[PDB]
C-alpha cells in the first residue's frame, strides 16, 4: 500500500508552484528541427538558389535557368538574394505579387509575343553588362528590352488575349535612362510613353529621366510591372519608347496553399508534413518554438522554451496508515489496483490529445512582406504577428499550468479517495508481514468482514 514514487527528476510547473518533480512527464513542445530545407508531403519546393522572385519571374540571367519549372509546395527566397534585379530598378507592387504568389503552386510559361515578331525594333541588342549571361552581355530572358532599328522606333501596337482558360501573369517594364542623350541613343523619340490597358487596367508611363547613382555599374533604372490577365481578356501595349516588352507570360495552373519562405538553408533529401525556415518537424505533439512561419500540417507555434505536461504524481500522502511513497511497488500508480490505476494511464494519451483538439484554434502565422515605404504596416504586421503568438503562448502556458495543477490534484485527490475507501471499509484507527493475504486480501478486494474481524475489535476494546 502506497502511492507510486520514482526518481525521474522530470519537473513540471503549475500556477502555485513553478517547479514540481513528477515521476512520468511528457513534453508537448518541439525544440528540435532537421536544419535542412525539406520536402512538404512529397512535393519538391521551388528553391531559388541565390535568386529572387523578381529575378525568377523576370528571368535574371545570373539566376538559374528555370526551364519548365514543376509544381512547388513553397518558394524559398533568401533574406538578401544576391541575384536581385540585375539591371537596377524597382518592381512595382513586388510584394502584392509575392503575396499573390503565395496562393499558387504551379506556373506554365507561355509565350505572349515572340522575339521574332519585333520586325521593326531590335530585340537582340537590348542587352546590358549588368546582366551577363554566360560571360556575354545579356538581359532578363522573359522580357525583351527593345531598341530602335534604323534610327526609328515605331509605336508598338500589340495585343494578347488570354485565350487560355486559366489565369495569366503579364510582365513588362519601363526603362529610365540617365539623360536625353541615352534616350536618343536607344529611342529616337525624345518624349515617350507606355500606355498599357486591360479590362481592369489603365496606366500610361512616361520615363522619369534623372541623374542617378550607379548600381551594378549602371545608373539607368528599370521599373517592372505585373498584371493578372483574366481568361478572355486582352492586354493592349502601346509604346513609342522605353518598352521592356513581354516575351513570356506565366499561366497560373493550380491555385493552392504556398508561402515564400525567407530561409537561407539548402536542400536536404527529406520528406516532412511540416516545414519551417529553420528546418522541419517530425512529431505529432502540438507545439513548437522554432519559427512561426511554417507550412503544412504542423505543430502550432508558441514562443516558450519549456512546456511539459504532468502525467504522474507529485514525487494523507504521509499520515498514519500509509507508509509513504514506497519506491518498491511498481505496478499501479496509487494502490497497486487495476480499477483505479489502469484507467489513469489510459487518460495520458487523452490529455495530450485534448490540447491538440483544444488549441487547434491557434493563430496561423502568415508570411507577409512590405517594402521600405510601408514600414508602418510591417510594424503593424509584426506586432500583430508577435502579439497573437504572445496571446496564444500565454494560453498554452496557462492551459498547461492549469492542466498540471488539475492532474496533480487529480492524483492527490484519488489517493485520498483510495485512502477514504480504505478508511471507511476498516472502520477502525488500528493500523493492523505474517498476516499477508489475511489482513491485506480483505482490503484489496473491497470486501471487509468487520463483524468477522470483531475479535480485533475485542482486542481493540481490550487494549484501550
Amino acid at each position, epitope marked *: 500500500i502506497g502511492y507510486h514514487a520514482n526518481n525521474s527528476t522530470e519537473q513540471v510547473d503549475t500556477i502555485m508552484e513553478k517547479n514540481v518533480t513528477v515521476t512520468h512527464a511528457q513534453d508537448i513542445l518541439e525544440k528540435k528541427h532537421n536544419g535542412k530545407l525539406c520536402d512538404l508531403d512529397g512535393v519538391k519546393p521551388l528553391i531559388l538558389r541565390d535568386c529572387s522572385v523578381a529575378g525568377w519571374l523576370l528571368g535574371n540571367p545570373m539566376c538559374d535557368e528555370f*526551364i519548365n519549372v514543376p509544381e512547388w509546395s513553397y518558394i524559398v527566397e533568401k533574406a538578401n538574394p544576391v541575384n536581385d534585379l540585375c539591371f537596377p530598378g524597382d518592381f512595382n507592387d513586388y510584394e502584392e505579387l509575392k503575396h499573390l504568389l503565395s496562393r499558387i503552386n504551379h506556373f506554365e510559361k507561355i509565350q505572349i509575343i515572340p522575339k521574332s515578331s519585333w520586325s521593326s525594333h531590335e530585340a537582340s541588342l537590348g542587352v546590358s553588362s549588368a546582366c551577363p549571361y554566360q560571360g556575354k552581355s545579356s538581359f532578363f530572358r522573359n522580357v525583351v528590352w527593345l531598341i530602335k532599328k534604323n534610327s526609328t522606333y515605331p509605336t508598338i501596337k500589340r495585343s494578347y488575349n488570354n485565350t487560355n482558360q486559366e489565369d495569366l501573369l503579364v510582365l513588362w517594364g519601363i526603362h529610365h535612362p540617365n539623360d536625353a542623350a541615352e534616350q536618343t541613343k536607344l529611342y529616337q523619340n525624345p518624349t515617350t510613353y507606355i500606355s498599357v490597358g486591360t479590362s481592369t487596367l489603365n496606366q500610361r508611363l512616361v520615363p522619369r529621366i534623372a541623374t542617378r547613382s550607379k548600381v551594378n555599374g549602371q545608373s539607368g533604372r528599370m521599373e517592372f510591372f505585373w498584371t493578372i490577365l483574366k481568361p478572355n481578356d486582352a492586354i493592349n501595349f502601346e509604346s513609342n519608347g522605353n518598352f521592356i516588352a513581354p516575351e513570356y507570360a506565366y499561366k497560373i495552373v493550380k491555385k493552392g496553399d504556398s508561402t515564400i519562405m525567407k530561409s537561407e538553408l539548402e536542400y536536404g533529401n527529406c520528406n516532412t508534413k511540416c516545414q519551417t525556415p529553420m528546418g522541419a518537424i517530425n512529431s505529432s505533439m502540438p507545439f513548437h518554438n522554432i519559427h512561426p512561419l511554417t507550412i503544412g500540417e504542423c505543430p502550432k507555434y508558441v514562443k516558450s522554451n519549456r512546456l511539459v505536461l504532468a502525467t504522474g504524481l507529485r514525487n494523507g500522502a504521509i499520515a498514519g496508515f500509509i507508509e509513504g511513497g514506497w519506491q518498491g511497488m511498481v505496478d499501479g500508480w496509487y494502490g497497486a489496483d487495476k480499477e483505479s490505476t489502469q484507467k489513469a494511464i489510459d487518460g495520458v494519451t487523452n490529455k495530450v490529445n485534448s490540447i491538440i483538439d483544444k488549441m487547434n484554434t491557434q493563430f496561423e502565422a502568415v508570411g507577409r512582406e512590405f517594402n521600405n515605404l510601408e514600414r508602418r504596416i510591417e510594424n503593424l504586421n509584426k506586432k500583430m504577428e508577435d502579439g497573437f503568438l504572445d496571446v496564444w503562448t500565454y494560453n498554452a502556458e496557462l492551459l498547461v499550468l492549469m492542466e498540471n495543477e488539475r492532474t496533480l490534484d487529480f492524483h492527490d485527490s484519488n489517493v485520498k479517495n483510495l485512502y477514504d475507501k480504505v478508511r471507511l471499509q476498516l472502520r477502525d484507527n488500528a493500523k493492523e508481514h505474517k498476516c499477508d493475504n489475511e489482513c491485506m486480501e480483505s482490503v484489496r478486494n473491497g470486501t471487509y468482514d468487520y463483524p468477522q474481524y470483531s475479535e480485533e475489535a475485542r482486542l481493540k476494546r481490550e487494549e484501550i
Partner: antibody
Amino acid sequence: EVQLVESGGGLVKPGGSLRLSCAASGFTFSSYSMNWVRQAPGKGLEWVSSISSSSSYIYYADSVKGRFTISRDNAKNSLYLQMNSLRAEDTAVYYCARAPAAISYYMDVWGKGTTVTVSG
Amino acid sequence: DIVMTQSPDSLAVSLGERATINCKSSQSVLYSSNNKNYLAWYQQKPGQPPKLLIYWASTRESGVPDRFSGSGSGTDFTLTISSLQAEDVAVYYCQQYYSTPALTFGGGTKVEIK
C-alpha cells in the same frame, strides 16, 4: 533472395471490395518504402499508391484516391492494399514495388503481380 | 498533373545496332538544389515484371548490362542501348519521381527486331 510475392487477386464485381497482400522476404521491409503499380491488359504501367517505411507518408493516384487504402505491417513483413467501390477500369496486374531510397521512389525489386479483374 | 511522353512507341532496331528511346517530360524533373534528374527507366518483357535499368536518368542499377546507358537532362531524356540483343526485346517505361504524390510512367516503347 529479394522477392515480393502478391496474393488476393481474383474475380470481382463492379462496386466490390478486395484486399491485396504482398508478402516480403530477403530484405529489411521496415527500411524501404513500398509502392503499388497496376498494368491493365494492353496498357502501360500506372502507379496506384504508396507508403513509407513508418507508414507516415501515404500517396494515391488521382483515379485511386478515396477508393483504396494502402497499409503495411512491418512486424509481419507484409504490405496490403484495400480496394473499395471498384470500377471496370481496374482490370490489371497489380505489381508490388519497393523503393530503396526513403525519398527517391525508383522501384528496384518488383513482384510477380496478381491479376485483379472487376467485371460482371 | 505532371505527365511523361515517349516519342517512339514501337522502335524497329535490328540486332547488334544502336537503339534510342526518347522520353520527354511535361515539367523538368531536374532539381537544381542537387542537380539530380529525377527519372527512372524500366524494362518489361511479355509476362515478366518491370526491371529497373537506369535511375537518376544516368546511374545504372546493379546487374543491368553495360550496353544500357541513360542520358539527357531537364525535360528530354534518352535510353541508349549500345547494341540490341534478343533479350532486350521488351517494353521500356520511363518514370519520374520528382512529384512523389503523383508518380506517372511513360506510355512505353517496345523495341522489336527488324
